[PDB]
Design a protein around this nucleic acid. Sequence first.
DNA 1: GCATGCTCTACTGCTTCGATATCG
DNA 2: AAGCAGTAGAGCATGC
Lengths: 386, 490
Amino acid sequence: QSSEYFQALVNNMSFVRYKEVYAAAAEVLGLILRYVMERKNILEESLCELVAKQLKQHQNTMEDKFIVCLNKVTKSFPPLADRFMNAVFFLLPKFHGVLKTLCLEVVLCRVEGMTELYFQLKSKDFVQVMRHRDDERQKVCLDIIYKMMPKLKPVELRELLNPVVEFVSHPSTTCREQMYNILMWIHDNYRDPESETDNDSQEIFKLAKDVLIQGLIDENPGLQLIIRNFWSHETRLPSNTLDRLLALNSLYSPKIEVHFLSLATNFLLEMTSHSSLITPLQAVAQRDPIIAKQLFSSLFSGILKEMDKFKTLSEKNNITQKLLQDFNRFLNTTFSFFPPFVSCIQDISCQHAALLSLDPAAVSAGCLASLQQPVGIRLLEEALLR
Amino acid sequence: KYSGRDSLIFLVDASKAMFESQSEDELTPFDMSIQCIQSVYISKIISSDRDLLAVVFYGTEKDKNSVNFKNIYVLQELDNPGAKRILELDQFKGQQGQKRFQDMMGHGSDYSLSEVLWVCANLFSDVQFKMSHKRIMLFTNEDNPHGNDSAKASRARTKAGDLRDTGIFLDLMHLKKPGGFDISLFYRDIISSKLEDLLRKVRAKETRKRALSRLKLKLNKDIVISVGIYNLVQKALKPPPIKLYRETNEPVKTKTRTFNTSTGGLLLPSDTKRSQIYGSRQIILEKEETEELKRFDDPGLMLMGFKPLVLLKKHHYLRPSLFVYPEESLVIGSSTLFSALLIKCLEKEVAALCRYTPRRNIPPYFVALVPQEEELDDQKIQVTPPGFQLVFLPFADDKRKMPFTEKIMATPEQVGKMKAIVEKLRFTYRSDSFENPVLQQHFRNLEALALDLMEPEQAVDLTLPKVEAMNKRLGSLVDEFKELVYPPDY
DNA sequence: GCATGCTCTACTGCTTCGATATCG
DNA sequence: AAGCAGTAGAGCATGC
């Protein structure tokens, strides 16, 4: 009958000397408990109580075997650490090695539904074990933070975000994949769109507009197709014809200038609707800088040549004064000047009597350090004429 | 476990009227609590000097805690009893200390709830060691501290239940707001007055437990049994006198050599031999030779007959007496053979006789194994454990010879007087408490240097006779017992 | 063909410290 | 004695 067989099994859990019997005993106990949980018609009220009484017998005599068996029962049974949740938090600054990974493996499961979490995790110095060179700890400790975002106030999220975005210089694409997975929500639901709210609710959006722009030069393609299809989404970069060209100035960020021209024509060239030669041009631009510079410098004046039909007389002045402002911003902002980009802006400005009066204090210190002096000399002389 | 350590957190309730004099000019409970805490530290700094002892005041005005709550001020952290900790802490004695605590932290606030027990749990969790005892000493006098808000009562009993789960237990040492124990209130929900243990009773003790030898008793040649030879009365004495440099205040780390062979130089273990002189002729030998001339047997116990408990007179003893117990590193069943041997040796009142060689090279020695059956009671008065006991036995030049040839008879006019005298002086023995004057005053004298209060402190010695209370208690029969039959008469 | 690479547990020793014999 | 820590060395899987 069903009163001694289970007792013999849970009693053989206590045979705690040899590795294979009690760990697999805990695992098969998790299987039995899960089958009788989802299959409710058979009772579980004896068995869950029996195995939990065994674990409460376990935890004070020896603790390593307690956390091992609780880890393996929770490997397929969530709700059986509620009775031990203060015990595992009591144990958490006591375990190193693989066992700290084991405790964190436990604590991931019973979060989504738990209140008042960040106090305990802040007490157990979480932001000093989110910054140690193991890999699996650092993957699991970020998968909890993808779960406990929508329970925090922005007073603490700006304390979490300061070492979680130290992970762009990390190896191991799953870890950085998590770190670009949390910022994708912190951008999409904190857009603070002129709402007059807070300085931290506008400051985390600044530091999350930093990393979704520095993450376009990652060393793992196949990942960056995700970030490109994020950034090339309708009403996320405005996709009419010309507004995308204007908005491409907004995501400049001088950590990516070495790739800026190829990225700009890529976002501009994706929205086609010719097939035989456009696709090798997209292919050939992002390999060599000079033909890419030529391609952006022709696309710019192509759209500005079409714009003189539409977009009436005041709007021409508005768009052109904004563009002049942006190019001034570029020359003042750049930190290590890229020559076939500095030449590209001072080559696309010189051919318009609306963008000429640029910044002669900026053109000079730009082209004495970019070593592209004869495009600047021609720009100032085309200015001093007319 | 053997290398296990215990832990204690002093949680002080200095909030509302405990900082007041209770409008009583008789005793102040803040200074009473700080005196009790000083007594605990000042005893366990030589009694049990490795446990963990922390001091935490709550209900204060400021705050100091690593989760950063309010009204809660931890003062020190879990560590040894230290002279710095007590010289820091005794600045809160008396009214001068009341004012100094007022200006240093202040007093009075709406004190906490569950959050102070949360601070205690985050104080215990940090320690990476093996905690064996988890106790909290609460010094409070109010007994309905949240008697206007039931949500805080329910959350406090919930958090105390979750502190009871992981293995933390509190014993609130009750201060005397009504003096007598008349607060028969409902504080049963949290707990698992008398202060004399914390006050006086332990000025010179220690705590330890080892086994001293693990030997094996062989009966014929092949029947072996394994016994641990415990020691139970050990003659504690004063610790070794560390050497110290004068100026830099550090140990000296001495070193030792041997030379000057009528040449100087420097020597080794091999160049020199051992020697003796006997009148006229000199012997020389090696160190292995003088260590091997006392070499008989192997370590263990050797069964050499049986005897009942009637020949041994307790005139005959030589050393203290050890205690042999059936350990568990030969077989599961040496306990059973010892239990059978115990039962038979006790019921036929027979005692074993053995030879006993203590360690790897010692001459053998005859012992006698006397059984002992345990005694416990209703309330677990575990006064004896069940097991066997060594008694040593002398050999030859132990027993000397007296002059001894004197035998004079007295007169029986004194026996009833002396029976009345010894019935006058009759007290039922003792169980404890006959402590050591020399070690005791050495403890107090060492207190009076690193604590340097005034002078050598109290030094009563409970081993002196009180002739002033003996004379009146006996009465005026001293003269009649002095000269009933016999005058000295000069 | 043996030449290499890789993995878990019993034999050796370490260190504290309490006791014990022994010297002075 | 009481406990920890290392590791030497014999036993699992694939190589000019």
